[PDB]
Paper text:
To improve the resolution of the cryo-EM structure of the CsgG-CsgF complex in order to accurately locate side chains of 9 Asn36 residues of CsgF that consist of the upper constriction region of the CsgG-CsgF channel, the purified CsgG-CsgF complex was proteolytically digested with chymotrypsin to remove flexible regions of the CsgG-CsgF complex that may affect the stability of the complex in the detergent-containing buffers and increase particle heterogeneity on the grid. The resulted protein sample (denoted as the CsgG-CsgF20–59 complex) contained a variant of CsgG that includes residues 47–252 in complex with the most N-terminal 40 residues of the mature CsgF (CsgF20–59), as confirmed by mass spectrometric analysis. Intriguingly, there exist 2 types of non-physiological inter-complex interactions: a head-to-head homodimeric interaction and a head-to-tail heterodimeric interaction within the filaments. Using a similar cryo-EM structure determination approach we obtained 2 maps for the nonameric CsgG-CsgF20–53 complex and the nonameric CsgG-CsgF20–59 complex, with an overall resolution of 2.9 Å and 3.2 Å, respectively (S4C, S4D). The structure of the nonameric CsgG-CsgF20–59 complex was obtained from an interacting mode in the filaments through which the most C-terminal 6 residues of each CsgF20–59 fragment interact with the periplasmic regions of each CsgG, stabilizing the conformation of the 6-residue loop of CsgF20–59 in the structure but with relatively weak densities. To test this, we found that increased salt concentrations in the sample buffer significantly decreased the lengths of the filaments formed on the grids.
Curli are functional amyloids that play critical roles in biofilm formation and adhesion in many Enterobacteriaceae. Two outer membrane proteins, CsgG and CsgF, form the core apparatus for secretion and assembly of the curli structural subunits. The free C-terminal domain of CsgF recruits and binds the secreted nucleator CsgB, creating a growth point for further addition of CsgA subunits.
Residue numbers in the entry:
A (entry chain e), F (entry chain f), G (entry chain h): 20 to 59
B (entry chain E), C (entry chain H), D (entry chain F), E (entry chain B): 47 to 252
């Protein structure tokens, strides 16, 4: 069938229900800590 | 010597229309065979096609010609000598006998931490039947069913991880290529025409 | 000797159209029998099909031939001798008498921690009726109902577990194969044709 | 001796179409009776069906035959002797008088901790009326209304519990079988034909 | 000297309609070839087109003319001398043989912390077949299939980050350009006309 | 009527609204404790 | 019927309602602890 390129990111490409996942799946892999606490 | 061939109508007998999001009336296969087939028979140096699709337009134009110069008052320079409607020894009928959507779909997609990439593909299949019938007796001399797959693929890749403490890098690059069903139908008609010519060669005719 | 057979119209009497997401006008079975059946009768070395589907195009082409050479002015090389429209001893009518969607669906899918995999299958069923009728008297000599199942399966697998503390590995690979309804309809017509030939053999005719 | 029977049209008078997700134009009962009924009358060794559905195609084919050999120039080997269109003593009309969707639905499903299983069933019902009418006088000799239930069931089972502290085992196996409405309509027509034959036996005729 | 050419109908044989959100009846290719083609043949200084599309309107207007001055009572100033409907030596038939939507889609979009930007593009493809047929004999003199891609792109950019503690700066600027399918169809017809003229030059005619 | 086999799990079988239940009804029956706390 | 291959992951394959499950069913099986706490 006809395949149309659609962006997955809600930014630049519309599909908004795809956002709450993309962010919660990027915070679930955020291994970066505040440079204030747990640092010098 | 070339063979006069009269292609009347290569009907879209697939009966299929395009699925959502396309229109409900948007047929999956072009209604334009008998133009791809006349082009295929003209391109192969074996046949001289005759119009026979728009024959009524040709007959009204010949009516106008025969009515414009029937008084002998037209200038002898711009008068058109009508001889007769050239007759065809054979006749190539046919149809687009089928269009199955997604005879084979598939796709592999991987995505590690943040960065990922995927691929999809879908094979439609269009089948075209061509029948060289002998106009003298009416029997079908040759009948070939040709198939052609239509590959529509899509490759995407995307990054949605954090670069710093609170710096989110989203980004993605995609690409998508559908083989035009008109080009694949023209290729199926082309292969069918080569088959018909070789078959006529292999038994007596041509 | 081969038998002249005139296939007029193998009508799509299933009445079914394709469900969502396909179009509402997208018929589930190709409208292109009488082209698959003429191909099946031509491929079996028993029959010579006559056109009879596009007979009007053949008759207009013969009109053009008979009008092009009725004055004796056409070159004796490129004149087409029309003998007569070849007559058929029998006539193979028929229909696509049914298309039931999902006569048997099913699927097993397992998924342990993260990694999983599944399979689905759906059997459509297409039934084609073929009737050899004797043109002399009009009685139906043979009538066969053939069936053919159309298996559409889909195998997928996917990983969505964590590899490290905060490293998510998503990924998945799938595959999906639908048997083309045109090929299954051609197979049903083929089996019906073999049945008709063997039946004509088993009682007197052929 | 067998009885010549002329089946003209067994019309789809149910008026029902298939519900969602199927197409709006997808009729619930095949439009292909008069092909299942001719097959049923041919299979029972009592009747010789005559075409009468495609009678116009037979008449044009006989036109072509009578025009091909009216000059006596056809070879005495491949000439077709037309006798006359065989006449039928009786005539089996009829209809598909009804298709009620889900005359009886139901289903039991249990599911303890994690593991569960269910079953569903739906009975459609198709009713077919068959009328043997006497062609001499026009009166209806026999009229039978036959019914047939169409059972579509579905059995599923599934596991979604935890096996370890944080190891989730999801999985499920299903199966679904719909009786083809074409086969059930053919069975209803078959029972109606047996009823008509036995009725003609039980009073004078046959 | 210029060649009289009669363009009767360049039919929209693509069969495609526009997908959602456009209407279901909104055809993807204009139905207005035979007006773009007459314009293309008029613009090239080789041909004089004749109307032949609206020929019935021309014939009724000539009826009115011939009925207005058949009594000799019209003023000799405003009388229109009808000579004859000018006859065409050749005839350019054709079709819009195909319109494949998204033969090649794609797009790259990046977005760092807050500020981002993306681009999309879609290539439709329209194919037009043109056939110069010789009105004297009816044979197709030339047949060309031309293609043309229709590029629809869209460039966007957007800022959604915080400027101060609690000061949110959202903003975005976009742009979107679709090539008009009418202009691309006119370009395909133009290239086909140049091909036909050069082909007629390369073999005898013109 | 025509019965079509549809998976109930949102994994392998599409219907996504069926997920938040399947999981919350599998955690409401999770009688497995952490092998660290409430153990040796 | 016609079977079309559709991805289940909202990333690469569209269906976004399938996300909140896929993640909450992957955190409900996350047996990996922070290499800082409950470690050396």
């Amino acid at each position: 069938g006809t395949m149309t390129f659609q962006f997955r990111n809600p930014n630049f490409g519309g599909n908004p229900n795809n956002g709450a996942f993309l962010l919660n799946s990027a915070q679930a892999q955020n291994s970066y800590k505040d440079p204030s606490y747990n640092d010098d | 010597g070339k063979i006069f061939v009269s292609v009347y109508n290569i009907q879209d007998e697939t009966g299929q229309f395009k699925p959502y999001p396309a229109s409900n009336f948007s047929t999956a296969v072009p209604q334009s065979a008998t133009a791809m087939l006349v082009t295929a028979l003209k391109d192969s140096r074996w046949f001289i096609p005759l119009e026979r699709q728009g024959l009524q337009n040709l007959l009204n134009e010949r009516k106008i010609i025969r009515a414009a110069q029937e008084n002998g008052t037209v200038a002898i320079n711009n008068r058109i000598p009508l001889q007769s409607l050239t007759a065809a020894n054979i006749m190539v009928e046919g149809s687009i006998i089928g269009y199955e959507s997604n005879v084979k779909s598939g796709g592999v997609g991987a995505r590690y931490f943040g960065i990922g990439a995927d691929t999809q593909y879908q094979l439609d299949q269009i089948a075209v039947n061509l029948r060289v019938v002998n106009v003298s007796t009416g029997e079908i001399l040759s009948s070939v069913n040709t198939s052609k797959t239509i590959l529509s693929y899509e490759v995407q890749a995307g990054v949605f991880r954090f670069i710093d403490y609170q710096r989110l890098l989203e980004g993605e690059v995609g690409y998508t290529s559908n083989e035009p069903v008109m080009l694949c139908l023209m290729s199926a008609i082309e292969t069918g025409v080569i088959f018909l010519i070789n078959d006529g060669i292999d038994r007596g005719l041509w």
